[PDB]
Design a binder for this molecule. Sequence first.
Ligand SMILES: COc1cc(Nc2nccc(Nc3ccc4c(C)n[nH]c4c3)n2)cc(OC)c1OC
Length: 281
Amino acid sequence: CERLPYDASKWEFPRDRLNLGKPLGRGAFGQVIEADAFGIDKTATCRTVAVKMLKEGATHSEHRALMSELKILIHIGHHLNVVNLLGACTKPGGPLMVIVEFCKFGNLSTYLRSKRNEFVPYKKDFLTLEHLICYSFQVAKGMEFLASRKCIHRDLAARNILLSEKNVVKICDLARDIYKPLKWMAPETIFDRVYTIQSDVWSFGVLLWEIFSLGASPYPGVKIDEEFCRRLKEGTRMRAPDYTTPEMYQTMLDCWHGEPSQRPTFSELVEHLGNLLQANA
Ligand SMILES: COc1cc(Nc2nccc(Nc3ccc4c(C)n[nH]c4c3)n2)cc(OC)c1OC
């Protein structure tokens, strides 16, 4: 994948126009940090951005990984409902840095949990059914986009959905091709370790359950063991979450169809959720 091209003219950002701020996360692969970037959208403005940068030193593997991730992001292109690439610092004499949009409210599951006593179905800063269906609609749109670029997301879950201003949600993009988180996995993946876009439709149903439980853990008080997998195969499903509509629960069950080809597609979900948005609003 580091074999796809890197057009520096289009993507390269000067390191002296990045001012690094607080770390958002770290791991045995990289470090993600908040930064202020001047002129990253060509305009004479500062924008807060998110930067993924390598570790203190080398590894070739880790270098190729981040570099491949950059090229994938370029290859996929832009959509409102994914975390978009803004630029990169790849030239010699500094660390490899990949620069993406910053989502200032962080991950969706943590956020929803924080609004459990600030929620009203209809009627301040309160969450309402409109908001939850709007988020669901947005993620579907994001996944419809990834699908059209022939990606699967290995971990479609509320923790991997970030929230920006103006209620915009973005899939934090785990992005592989036609591919070969147990509570989020389709049964054909659990048993065959294989991921397709229809496997993501299953995970999206679990994500919907997360949204309409306001950030609860899936399969409450259930052991993820040999039984759980037997139960899922036989057709056992989660019960409705506390804040769901009937139609949203029906959609969850649709997404959890045993046969992958009987699950709706993301396009179908975008349509259906758009009508629920209009029926609510
Ligand atoms: C969820 O963590 C936050 C993300 C953000 N916002 C954000 N925008 C774009 C990319 C990005 N990457 C990113 C960072 C950190 C992590 C960890 C850890 N796992 N995966 C991660 C991905 N993050 C803002 C935050 O503060 C507002 C966060 O912490 C509350």
